[PDB]
Input
Amino acid sequence: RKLALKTIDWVAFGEIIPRNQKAVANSLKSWNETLTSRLATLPEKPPAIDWAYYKANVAKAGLVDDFEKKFNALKVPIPEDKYTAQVDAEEKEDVKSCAEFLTQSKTRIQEYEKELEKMRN
Amino acid sequence: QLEEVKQASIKQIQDAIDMEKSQQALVQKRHYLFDVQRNNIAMALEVTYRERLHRVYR
Output
């Protein structure tokens, strides 16, 4: 498993953030840099066990059979969420970055650009 | 006479430039934070499943 599917560019996230979090982005960038590099290394999982070999060749062949029906049944989970509240914070921070600031910016850039049509006089 | 007309033309474009860029900037990075963040998250959930298979097999 590689980087989580969503990829935003490393300079477009990494220059710009709300004023409330301004210094925390440049740290969180480096924290996500070490995590994305640290996770990109790993073969996700080992091989299986050759069982008929292990049962023949460990001459304690009945200790072996416990560990078959145990290991063949005993399956590992992937770790869970605890911080996808960053996606709700991202929808709220897009309502802020887009809609709230976008429409407010479109009336303020127009406040100047309508004064630039007045400056044509 | 000449000063004020050129002065206004400068000062207006000064405030115009930053604000269309300020618009774009807030959107793009912040959308660009989101999917960034969630990389970093999902990165680890597979490792741990991944790594686990090796660890338990050992």
Remarks:
- The radius of gyration of chain B is 26 Å.
- The interface with chain A takes residues 5, 8-9, 12-13, 15-16, 19-20, 22-23, 25-54, 56-58 of chain B (CB under 8 Å).
